[PDB]
Amino acid sequence: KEESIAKMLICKVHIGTKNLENKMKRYVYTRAKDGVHIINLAKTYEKLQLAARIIVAISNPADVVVVSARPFGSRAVLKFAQYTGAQAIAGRWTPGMLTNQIIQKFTEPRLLIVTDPRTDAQSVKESAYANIPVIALCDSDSPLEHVDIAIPCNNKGKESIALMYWLLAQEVLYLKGVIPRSEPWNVMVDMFLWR
């Protein structure tokens, strides 16, 4: 509640880049006089928890994959997957792994997680050949094609991405019976961060 809010007010997730786009009008509160938009974060919070409630519905978490093509999203996604039961892929995405059933890796999931649809549009594209729902960490300018759960947040900031995935994992663990809601955590956001 208040402590959870204090644990994420200090970051830079509030700030969203320019190019307002059209389908993020609801999520953007206004454009600052400088020219940079700001997210409500009061929509981000329950978008986070509903994304978690649909992640937890997958019986085996290894059936959910998380992708990121950015250097400071790679650490976040790998550590998020390790802390939850999911298995993630970072860096370069080979563009056949969702539709080509012969290649040795394949690994078709039941749910996809995307750090930035602009940067990894390939995975978002391939999800529409296999009925993968796709949750995306959408920014003020990110396209919303083939994404169902838009999380309005910053996709550039290393701290923004790290906190984003950290509280996503924390909320999925809360939805699990692993730890009670009230108890404070012992895993630091800087640990999720990028070195």
Partner: peptide, 28 residues
């Protein structure tokens, strides 16, 4: 891949802008 990256992994592991301010004060 061998037994050299694990030790380095262990070594490596260990007011506000006014529009945001009014946004937060509106929210609560």
């Amino acid at each position: 891949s061998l037994k050299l990256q694990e030790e380095e992994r262990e070594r490596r592991l260990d007011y506000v802008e006014p529009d945001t301010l009014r946004m937060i004060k509106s929210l609560g």
